[PDB]
Amino acid sequence: KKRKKKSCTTPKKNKHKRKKVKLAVLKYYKVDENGKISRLRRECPSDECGAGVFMASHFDRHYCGKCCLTYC
């Protein structure tokens, strides 16, 4: 049995390529004229990411990337 070639299928399943965000770290904090710090999103209650990591505001939900926490 010489091994058959047969490569045909739904032509390509492409693999997710990383979305490269340029200086996105800066978007989190809002600096006023005095030099004050305004946090535009919510802090996460979980232990590992506590006080060092923030959450995401999607329209209907809040999502932290470490422990995968979700709220409405």
Binding-site residue numbers for Zn(2+) are 44, 49, 64, 67
Q: Residue 61, SS3?
A: coil
DSSP state letter for 31 = E
β partners of residue 23? none
Q: Tell me the number of residues near other proteins by CB under 8 A.
A: 11
Q: Tell me the number of residues near Zn ion by CB under 5 A.
A: 7
53, amino acid identity = V
**CA–CA separation, 62 vs 72, rounded Å?**
7
Q: Which is nearer to other proteins, 25 or 72 (CB)?
A: 25
46 binds, among other proteins, Zn ion, none (CB under 5 to 8 A by kind): Zn ion
In the complex, the residues that contact other proteins under the rule CB under 8 A are: 23, 25-26, 29, 31, 35-37, 51-53
